[PDB]
Amino acid sequence: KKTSFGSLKDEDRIFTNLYGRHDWRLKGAQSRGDWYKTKEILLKGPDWILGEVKTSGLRGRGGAGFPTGLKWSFMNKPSDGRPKYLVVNADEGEPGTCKDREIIRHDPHKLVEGCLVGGRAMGARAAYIYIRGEFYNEASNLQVAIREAYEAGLIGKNACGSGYDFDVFVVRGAGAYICGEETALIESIEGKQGKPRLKPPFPADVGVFGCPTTVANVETVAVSPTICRRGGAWFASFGRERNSGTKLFNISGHVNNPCTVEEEMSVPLKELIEKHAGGVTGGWDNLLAVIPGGSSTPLIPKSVCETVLMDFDALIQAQTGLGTAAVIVMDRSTDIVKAIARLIEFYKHESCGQCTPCREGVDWMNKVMARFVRGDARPAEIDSLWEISKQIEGHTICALGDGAAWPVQGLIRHFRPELEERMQQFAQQHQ
Amino acid sequence: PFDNTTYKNLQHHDYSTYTFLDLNLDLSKFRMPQPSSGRESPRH
Amino acid sequence: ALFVHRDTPENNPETPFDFTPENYKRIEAIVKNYPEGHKAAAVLPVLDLAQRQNGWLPISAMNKVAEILQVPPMRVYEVATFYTMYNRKPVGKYHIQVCTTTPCMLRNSDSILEAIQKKLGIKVGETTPDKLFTLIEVECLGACVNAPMVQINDNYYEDLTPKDIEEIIDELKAGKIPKPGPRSGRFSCEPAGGLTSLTEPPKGPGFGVQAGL
Amino acid sequence: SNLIEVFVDGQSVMVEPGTTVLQACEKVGMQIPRFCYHERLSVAGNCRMCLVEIEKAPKVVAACAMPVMKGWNILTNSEKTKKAREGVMEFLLANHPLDCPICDQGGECDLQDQSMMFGSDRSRFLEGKRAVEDKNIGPLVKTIMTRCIQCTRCIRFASEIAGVDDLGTTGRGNDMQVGTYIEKMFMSELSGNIIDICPVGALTSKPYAFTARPWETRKTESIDVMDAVGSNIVVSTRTGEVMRILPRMHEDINEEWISDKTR
Numbered sequence A: 001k002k003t004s005f006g007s008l009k010d011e012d013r014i015f016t017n018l019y020g021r022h023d024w025r026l027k028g029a030q031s032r033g034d035w036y037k038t039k040e041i042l043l044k045g046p047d048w049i050l051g052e053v054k055t056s057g058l059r060g061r062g063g064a065g066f067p068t069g070l071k072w073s074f075m076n077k078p079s080d081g082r083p084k085y086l087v088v089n090a091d092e093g094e095p096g097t098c099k100d101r102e103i104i105r106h107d108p109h110k111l112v113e114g115c116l117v118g119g120r121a122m123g124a125r126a127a128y129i130y131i132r133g134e135f136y137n138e139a140s141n142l143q144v145a146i147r148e149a150y151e152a153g154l155i156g157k158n159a160c161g162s163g164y165d166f167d168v169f170v171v172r173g174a175g176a177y178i179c180g181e182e183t184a185l186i187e188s189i190e191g192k193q194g195k196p197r198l199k200p201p202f203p204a205d206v207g208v209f210g211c212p213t214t215v216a217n218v219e220t221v222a223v224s225p226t227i228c229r230r231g232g233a234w235f236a237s238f239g240r241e242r243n244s245g246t247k248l249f250n251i252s253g254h255v256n257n258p259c260t261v262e263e264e265m266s267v268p269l270k271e272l273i274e275k276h277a278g279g280v281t282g283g284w285d286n287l288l289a290v291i292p293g294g295s296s297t298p299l300i301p302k303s304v305c306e307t308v309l310m311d312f313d314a315l316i317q318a319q320t321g322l323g324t325a326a327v328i329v330m331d332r333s334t335d336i337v338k339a340i341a342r343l344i345e346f347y348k349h350e351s352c353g354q355c356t357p358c359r360e361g362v363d364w365m366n367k368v369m370a371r372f373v374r375g376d377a378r379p380a381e382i383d384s385l386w387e388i389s390k391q392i393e394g395h396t397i398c399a400l401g402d403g404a405a406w407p408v409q410g411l412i413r414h415f416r417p418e419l420e421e422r423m424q425q426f427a428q429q430h431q
Numbered sequence B: 001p002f003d004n005t006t007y008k009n010l011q012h013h014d015y016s017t018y019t020f021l022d023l024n025l026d027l028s029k030f031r032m033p034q035p036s037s038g039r040e041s042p043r044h
Numbered sequence C: 001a002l003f004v005h006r007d008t009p010e011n012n013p014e015t016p017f018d019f020t021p022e023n024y025k026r027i028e029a030i031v032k033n034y035p036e037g038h039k040a041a042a043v044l045p046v047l048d049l050a051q052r053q054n055g056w057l058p059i060s061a062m063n064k065v066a067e068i069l070q071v072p073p074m075r076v077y078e079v080a081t082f083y084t085m086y087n088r089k090p091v092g093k094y095h096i097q098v099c100t101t102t103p104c105m106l107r108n109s110d111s112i113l114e115a116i117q118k119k120l121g122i123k124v125g126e127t128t129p130d131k132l133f134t135l136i137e138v139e140c141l142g143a144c145v146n147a148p149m150v151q152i153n154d155n156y157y158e159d160l161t162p163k164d165i166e167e168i169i170d171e172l173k174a175g176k177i178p179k180p181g182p183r184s185g186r187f188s189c190e191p192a193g194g195l196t197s198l199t200e201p202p203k204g205p206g207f208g209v210q211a212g213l
Numbered sequence D: 001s002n003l004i005e006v007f008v009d010g011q012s013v014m015v016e017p018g019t020t021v022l023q024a025c026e027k028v029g030m031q032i033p034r035f036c037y038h039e040r041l042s043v044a045g046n047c048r049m050c051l052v053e054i055e056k057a058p059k060v061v062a063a064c065a066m067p068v069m070k071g072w073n074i075l076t077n078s079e080k081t082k083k084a085r086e087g088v089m090e091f092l093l094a095n096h097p098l099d100c101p102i103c104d105q106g107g108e109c110d111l112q113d114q115s116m117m118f119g120s121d122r123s124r125f126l127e128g129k130r131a132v133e134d135k136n137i138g139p140l141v142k143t144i145m146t147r148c149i150q151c152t153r154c155i156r157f158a159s160e161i162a163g164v165d166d167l168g169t170t171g172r173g174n175d176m177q178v179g180t181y182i183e184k185m186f187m188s189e190l191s192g193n194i195i196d197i198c199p200v201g202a203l204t205s206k207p208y209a210f211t212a213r214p215w216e217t218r219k220t221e222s223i224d225v226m227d228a229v230g231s232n233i234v235v236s237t238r239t240g241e242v243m244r245i246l247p248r249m250h251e252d253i254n255e256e257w258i259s260d261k262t263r
């Protein structure tokens, strides 16, 4: 067992064209190991592929972190007449998250091969890659790559000479963050408003077009071929137990070199920021708070960031979450209340409006936060806002409602003196 | 030789309005025949 | 900003719209991507194709999409008003979209927005009198490590300063088309001042491949 | 044989597979509060008024949509269930207009009654309220859309019962609006039934507007003669005058609908 994690070697990185300095097209992809022995992987069978993903300990990289091997095994059942589909979530809408964008445009063939291998394990006839409409150039890059795979016989009829037919369609979104939610993504593909479905049924039983479906994040799908080639045991050698593998991180905000970088799971938060992002603007002592996994995760203050690790279990114990592993850094010159208030404004603009607690509650929370920014409120409203957030959390159809409540809870948990100070200043200036 | 100092993703600077859908038209001849629900639509 | 339609002389059911013969060929490819019996799945791509041909979506374009795909017009109206990339009113030739969500705000997207307004002489949500530019704020565009950034039509312009965006607008006025991507010195999402990873040449086919395959 | 055993507050009940939690409760005489759910429409699950605790489960379930599992104990009166109802009611009323005195639904309003029975007794909403513009959908149904609670019952009735896909939702989030988008009249021979199924005073009878209050009406159960179907009706009268006609449920004839001529 390892005590410490990080310092991932280049030989062990999966996304080796992360920065687009090598040819992203098929020839460059093959020279880097993509599409190698895909036929042999396919001829191993869905159970062997699903075993490798289970052994790798891989968990969903879209934000929720479900164990990928178990989730994909819901599809490993006899057909009943309906087709079966893999839906790749390339909506990438969480603020702070831009990792999936670099996979699609610089390593498109990893994603295409992942669809074939991942789709084979589920017995899917095709993959629908849902990419946010704003990613037009990335969508075109992916479409060029898919045409190359088709022309080379790597997908389509008799993919990789394996006797398995598989198509890969790209469908673009039209501007909605809620379409990253797995059931709302399915609804969007079907030509409706992106409004999430209740569960049950679950997608593996009733999904896109009403057929058995699996929705998977781009990063989850793109690492599957490598896991099969190099083995699950290789992947599980990275990170803590139940926190396996490498991870793409986005470090943005008040850092010297905001960047995307691949790094081992369970790396300390401080080492990640200082080693790869060039440190906090103005020095580590200038740090105020970090949102560790995209806007939906509660912020943690500087004291927590001193020692916390970046994996699913460590961040849960710190009262937050890994999320998409989008690290947003705020230095001490930040107006923390405004920064969080802007995130609630984001959720207010993205709420699909379907269900009452988020249609009405998020808009309500948005109004209170705007007053809290100016201090035009009473301290008794802080506890009220906490209770409103708890009335949204766990009572909505989808997790966007949970995602709007958690950032508010993070602000109140760690920066209540700041909120009260703003109110006290306003009362004097307006006495 | 080997180089690591240049950006090799410049093709998209020449993409245009219909690039994505033109590629989708090209891909149409490689697809497998679609399945059918057995009716023209849910309203039939 | 409203979500009800009032017929005007320039936007009514009799406003001319029809897909060009080439666009009808592209529609067949779109519709063929989906199982038979589920043509409605083509509403989003086809509705966006109408905007690409026309620039925006008059009520007559929305009606034409409903007719082609044999879906009730209301279901096209619901999609047109739900997704924010659809323009139900005309937009300037260059739709400037500035991200102002917290990660871009933390890196001074306000300066970018203020620089644009000062140069173009317009406020957010407005179109220039020449009808060349329209300006709006948008939520996260998925390029947060490259903040602050804007999207003009289909392209991203990244790591902007007030000087960079003003140069981009000057090129657009001149009829040139600026190259997308970071304007700071780097090429994409790599850390500035030197790669901290992927410095070594990547391994070739078969590296680390487990035994048994 | 086929039936499975579930429990409603510890009381065993045998139900068929596929029975929802809400239907299991109604087997023992407990009516779960609802707004979006209507047993003759397709399930929606959007209002969230039906949330109920399942014993030993940390998350409340939407009773109207959740299929009941064998051995579940549905706690319809637990503290968790009551707080869920109070919270949802609080969100429903936050933007609702202070219209009861001028609103024809007053006195027979499911929002009023479930607020009394399941909601808190006061407000902590300190902001301004939403206001929505009204739609004109013909001479029979008056729309005061600021009262709408986005339950989508009208949309589902129009699509499924009347077979008319003219009603929908436009916009997003708090600004989501029920209507036709374009100026358009909802003239169908069953159009008036959306007045009945709208839980609030958002859709009201135009001919009936302002003329009576529910508590003062006398109800005479009777039969329709506008056609030969024989729809069962209720004639509301006050002080010797006929005031309106309402459907009277009859499963084997009109169910709970009537035609606009009958109405």
Ligand SMILES: Cc1cc2nc3c(=O)[nH]c(=O)nc-3n(C[C@H](O)[C@H](O)[C@H](O)COP(=O)(O)O)c2cc1C
Residues within 6 Å of the ligand: A059, A060, A061, A062, A063, A064, A065, A066, A071, A089, A090, A091, A092, A093, A094, A177, A178, A179, A180, A181, A182, A183, A215, A216, A217, A218, A220, A221, A398, A399, A400, A403
């Ligand atoms: C509001 C909202 C937005 C989401 N956006 C994304 C997204 O952009 N990309 C993504 O992979 N998952 C997103 N998710 C999570 C998905 O619903 C789902 O958990 C994920 O796609 C499953 O893939 P995975 O198991 O491989 O992680 C979002 C969820 C919510 C509630």
Ligand code: SF4
Residues within 6 Å of the ligand: A178, A195, A196, A350, A351, A352, A353, A354, A355, A356, A358, A359, A396, A397, A398, A399, A400, A401, A402
């Ligand atoms: S929580 Fe918000 S986004 Fe999710 S279904 Fe409910 S209203 Fe829509």
Ligand code: SF4
Residues within 6 Å of the ligand: D096, D097, D098, D099, D100, D101, D103, D104, D105, D106, D107, D109, D110, D111, D112, D147, D199, D200, D201, D202
């Ligand atoms: S719908 Fe009910 S709660 Fe709303 S104003 Fe009318 S009577 Fe009052």
Ligand code: SF4
Residues within 6 Å of the ligand: D147, D148, D149, D150, D151, D152, D153, D154, D155, D178, D197, D198, D199, D200, D202, D203
């Ligand atoms: S108008 Fe009435 S029935 Fe229709 S969505 Fe609003 S509250 Fe529900």
Ligand code: FES
Residues within 6 Å of the ligand: A095, A096, A097, C099, C100, C101, C102, C103, C104, C105, C139, C140, C141, C142, C143, C144, C147, C149
């Ligand atoms: S916050 Fe601006 S691109 Fe993400």
Ligand code: FES
Residues within 6 Å of the ligand: D033, D034, D035, D036, D037, D044, D045, D046, D047, D048, D049, D050, D051, D062, D063, D064, D065
């Ligand atoms: S009655 Fe169940 S969510 Fe509305």
Ligand SMILES: [K+]
Residues within 6 Å of the ligand: D105, D194, D195, D196, D197, D198, D199, D200, D201, D202, D203, D204
């Ligand atoms: K009513």
